[PDB]
Write a protein that binds this ligand. Structure first.
Ligand SMILES: CN1CC/C=C/[C@H](O)[C@@H]2CC[C@H]2CN2C[C@@]3(CCCc4cc(Cl)ccc43)COc3ccc(cc32)[C@@](O)(C(=O)O)CC1=O
Length: 155
């Protein structure tokens, strides 16, 4: 399942990088060029989402009250409720992953870094297993990179 594997790699790297503030220097697996570009795109667009919706992000984090492994496990149901049960577009996918990064940073701050990888898996499961048809129709991570591509300015 190449789409699942690629998705998990991109999402896991972004969440870990957000939490630690350090780039992972290990090579990507399969489809490395696209995955690198996808991660670069999340760095740009995801960071903006977290700031544009800072108050709402903080509010939801507070409401969720994430302390430990069991709370992190409980998030799948919430993601299905909020993300899966609605329209699908790249913006909503970016928000799913960006709020994930916001939770990952919280996990670092409460010294529960071990829960970041399970969190990344949960987000990937929700995205790929509930929206595969859409993702395939939209050309997967190549489509993601194409959708957010910015042309160079003249001059
Ligand atoms: C205009 N916006 C962005 C501002 C809305 C902020 C919301 O109050 C709340 C703060 C987090 C967001 C709720 N979640 C966050 C949520 C749902 C809460 C649990 C959760 C946990 C993780 Cl690890 C990742 C994501 C999520 C599901 O992902 C979302 C995707 C799309 C939208 C909202 C999502 C979103 O698409 C939606 O609200 O439907 C976001 C949207 O329209």
């Amino acid at each position: 399942d190449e789409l699942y594997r690629q998705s998990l790699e991109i999402i896991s790297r972004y969440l870990r990088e957000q939490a630690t503030g350090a780039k992972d220097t290990k090579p990507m697996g399969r489809s490395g060029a696209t995955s690198r570009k996808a991660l670069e795109t999340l760095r740009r667009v995801g960071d903006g989402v977290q700031r544009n919706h800072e108050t709402a992000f903080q509010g939801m984090l507070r409401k969720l009250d994430i302390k430990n492994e069991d709370d992190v496990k409980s998030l799948s149901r919430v993601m299905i409720h909020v993300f899966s049960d609605g329209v699908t577009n790249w913006g909503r996918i970016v928000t799913l992953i960006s709020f994930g990064a916001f939770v990952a940073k919280h996990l670092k701050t409460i010294n529960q870094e071990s829960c970041i990888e399970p969190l990344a898996e949960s987000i990937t499961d929700v995205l790929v297993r509930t929206k595969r048809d859409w993702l395939v129709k939209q050309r997967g991570w190549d489509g993601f990179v194409e959708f957010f591509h910015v042309e160079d300015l003249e001059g």
